[PDB]
Amino acid sequence: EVQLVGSGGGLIQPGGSLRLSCAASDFSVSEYYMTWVRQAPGKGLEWVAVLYKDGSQFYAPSVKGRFIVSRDNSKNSLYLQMNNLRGEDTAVYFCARENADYGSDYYFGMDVWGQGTAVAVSSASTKGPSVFPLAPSGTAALGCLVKDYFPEPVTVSWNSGALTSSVHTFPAVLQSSGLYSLSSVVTVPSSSLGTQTYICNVNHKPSNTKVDKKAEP
Amino acid sequence: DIVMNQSPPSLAVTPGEPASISCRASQSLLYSDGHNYLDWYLQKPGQAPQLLIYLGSTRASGVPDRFSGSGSGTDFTLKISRVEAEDVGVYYCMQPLQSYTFGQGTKLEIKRTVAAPSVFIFPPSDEQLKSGTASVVCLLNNFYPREAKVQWKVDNALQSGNSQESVTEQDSKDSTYSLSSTLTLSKADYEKHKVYACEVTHQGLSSPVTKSFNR
């Protein structure tokens, strides 16, 4: 499988620096033009940096002289060193393989993208979430309450990725406390209630917290 | 300083109907090499953008027949001949000629019949009460259209500025929505009452619907 998987990122105080990683599979990051595209919360797509196979580097004006695009020929990785971070930088960063060589004529668009890693510039310290069970009783519904955390994102799944269909993880809501909070739910048959383990796996990267909660009647 | 202008911001389409999104550039994305340098990308909710069409008019490997890109010079059009429930998301156009710039984006929505919500109410966990807070959670599962009234009533006496909602993105299988409303109370106030109720009005319901419980 050909893909980009990126990592790093998380919460980082204003002014601080931060390195985003991104690693190729089944192609060489040294053999394609590579790009970094970000997306501010709610807002749309903004290009940030490009690194050409033909050595060179260029940056969007908004960041130029704070970000740096490096690759590693041996680690097969693309990097985005981000220095002196303003809040205007908090967004989701996507590295992408621009399948093009202007040398020859050919061009084939942003061929491959990464899953996208989140960066949050903020004064405030992290806080990991409390998880509480949402308990049930044709078909029935159960869920998890993921209260009081910061910053976004938090990732929820059920039975370690097994249970997908009928699942609904809601957008986080901002609470009066400055802290985010969400809920995730599944609808299942009332019959498999007495006989099926339903555990939701909450994972909050920047607070290093990781919870598996057994929702039961 | 090429600027792209996408039209419209949003459009609703019934599966089977055609759709047609427009991108308009500040300058000509026609290059002296005899090619049109403009792309079309789909960003399905909570995913990375996926390429649809490069070089103004050439569909990428894997993209369905139904997607076609046309245009030249400075005016361009992405067209879906027959929309499917799963074409829902946001469509962006990008030019890779002068820097890299994107359209404002275009939210594609599916139209479908009315769907009434099935409703669930969740009393606060014992685990959470042992922490001085009480969250009463209410689920509206798989309904259409998107608008719905959720009214909390404690000891039959409704609240205000007391709850808050969150709504899923339109599902890509059945083009439905789902909704969470959350009544947050102090552990204090929560013991002071016995019946908690969740009253939802919605287009797919003849008369309103309540789900409730007892302490």
């Binding site: 290009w47 490009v50 050409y52 033909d54 050595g55 060179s56 260029f58 940056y59 093009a100 202007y102 040398g103 061009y107 | 290059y31 340098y37 890779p96 000629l97 002068q98 820097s99 890299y100």
Partner: peptide, 11 residues
């Protein structure tokens, strides 16, 4: 040969 970001800046 790369004067800037984009196809338009390749000599």
């Amino acid at each position: 040969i790369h004067i800037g970001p984009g196809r338009a800046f390749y000599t």
